[PDB]
């Protein structure tokens, strides 16, 4: 198939961000002609299931069907839409009322900003009227793994793509011990996914990380510790305060020697130690990178230059209330993609509507969260007490200048609107205990996810 020489809407990076954009473009301006160029050969799909929902599928054909049952009991696929609902790259600049074409297995390798053109890996060039960068990002590798030999390197996976899941699902039924390095969102979610699978398979599940407790970059120590202990229950050997020093191959099995001196024998390793943005095209185009936050530097309306927007994880925008930041969540990729698409069609409206995130670590831990959630800030957790400490349920406020900037709804569900208001308001509330009463914590509420 041949690429169209020109297209009005070019979305570099066929992920969760690109899809929202194209959907929002098609919506705001009907009969749009949108081309998503995606280095990935898979059509746009959502990632959350790959750490959570697809590991709990009873159907053993899950690795092939890539379906799951939503917390509402309805069954769906991780793909945003089926192939039939995309037009072809060939037929895009003709088909009546345009549509969305996805160019699978094609990387943009140069962004000619001045001339409104991209050059593809295969030479073929495509000009655009409006362009969005939605390159997302690639998972960070652990230094120690890089330094080690290719024997150990070959037995180390990272997690992002579909194949990552499909291969680690196999490896879960093969080895006797899997060690996850890193205490991240993903770290924990995989450790708990494998932990639940181990209830039947009996496999050793180890998770080690340098923090004192799980999710130590977004949870305050007490909760962080408590969450670690709840992960433990799901079937995980958790080793906090683990700084890896070197990983060799001892006895046909990977040996992880920590700086504190502890050794760990295991068969396979999965590093979930953070995400690096795919800011490749920055140099080619002369677009700015946030020195502090990483990713492309875009203004309040996710705009970089006259005809270039950025969204998703790759985008470091200016949140008019919370300040400049880059956020790497799923609802963020969607919200920002939506907005970019609006602005591309000419709305020029700023990021006002907040994006959020959620994680579920077993049945005991499930939290929606909004805005500036960063364990380094001062927190005020308000939890429910009974009628030997139970942080089972409550709400945690994140402060900056005596102003709430982030909230974590701890096992409190369907309350995100209320929280959202509190962020908008950014009042200097004398007592946050009152503000907490707004979330009817003690009340059973709804048990989504």
């Amino acid at each position: 198939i041949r690429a169209p020489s020109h297209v009005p809407f070019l979305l570099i990076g066929g992920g969760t961000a690109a899809f929202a954009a194209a959907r929002s473009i098609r919506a705001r301006d009907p009969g749009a002609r949108v081309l998503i160029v995606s280095e990935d050969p898979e059509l746009p799909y959502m990632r959350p299931p790959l750490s959570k929902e697809l590991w709990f599928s009873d159907d053993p054909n899950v690795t092939k069907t890539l379906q799951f049952r939503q917390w509402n009991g309805k069954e769906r696929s991780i793909y945003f839409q089926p192939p039939s609902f995309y037009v072809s790259a060939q037929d895009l600049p003709n088909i009546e009322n345009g549509g969305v074409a996805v160019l699978t297995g094609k990387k943009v390798v140069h962004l000619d900003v001045r001339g409104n053109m991209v050059k593809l890996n295969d030479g073929s060039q495509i000009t655009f009227e409006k362009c969005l960068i939605a390159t997302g990002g690639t998972p960070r590798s652990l230094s120690a793994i890089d330094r080690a030999g290719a024997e150990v390197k070959s037995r180390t996976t990272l997690f992002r793509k579909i194949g990552d899941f499909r291969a680690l699902e196999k490896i879960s039924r093969e080895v006797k011990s899997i060690t996850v390095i890193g205490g991240g969102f993903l770290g924990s979610e995989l450790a708990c996914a494998l932990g639940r699978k181990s209830q039947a398979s009996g496999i050793e599940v180890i998770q080690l990380f340098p923090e004192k407790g799980n999710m130590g970059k977004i949870l305050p120590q007490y909760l962080s510790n408590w969450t670690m202990e709840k992960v433990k229950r799901e079937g995980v050997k958790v080793m906090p305060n683990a700084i890896v020093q070197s990983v060799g191959v001892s006895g046909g099995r990977l040996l992880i020697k920590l700086k504190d001196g502890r050794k760990v024998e295991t068969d396979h390793i999965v590093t979930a130690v953070g995400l690096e943005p795919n800011v490749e095209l920055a140099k080619t185009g002369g677009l700015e990178i946030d020195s502090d936050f990483g990713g492309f530097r875009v203004n309040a309306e996710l705009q970089a230059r006259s005809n270039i927007w950025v969204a998703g994880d790759a985008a470091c925008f200016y949140d008019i209330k919370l300040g400049r930041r880059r956020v790497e969540h799923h609802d963020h990729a969607v919200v920002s993609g939506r907005l970019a698409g609006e602005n591309m069609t000419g709305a020029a409206k700023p990021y006002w509507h907040q994006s959020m995130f959620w994680s579920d670590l077993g049945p005991d831990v499930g939290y929606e969260a909004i805005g500036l959630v960063d364990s380094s800030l001062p927190t005020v957790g308000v939890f429910a007490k009974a009628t030997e400490e139970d942080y089972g349920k409550g709400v945690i406020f994140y402060l900056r200048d005596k102003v709430v900037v982030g909230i974590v709804l701890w096992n409190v569900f369907n309350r995100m609107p209320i929280a959202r208001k509190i962020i908008k308001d950014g009042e200097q509330h004398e007592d946050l205990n009152e503000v907490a009463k707004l979330f009817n914590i003690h009340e059973d509420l709804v048990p989504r996810g």
Binding site: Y222, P378, T379, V380, A384, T387, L432, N433, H442
Partner: peptide, 18 residues
């Protein structure tokens, strides 16, 4: 109203009664 301050993080427990 068990309120206790642990560094930067402040922890308030409450029992529903209002």
């Amino acid at each position: 109203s068990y309120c206790r301050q642990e560094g930067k993080d402040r922890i308030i427990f409450v029992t529903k009664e209002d």
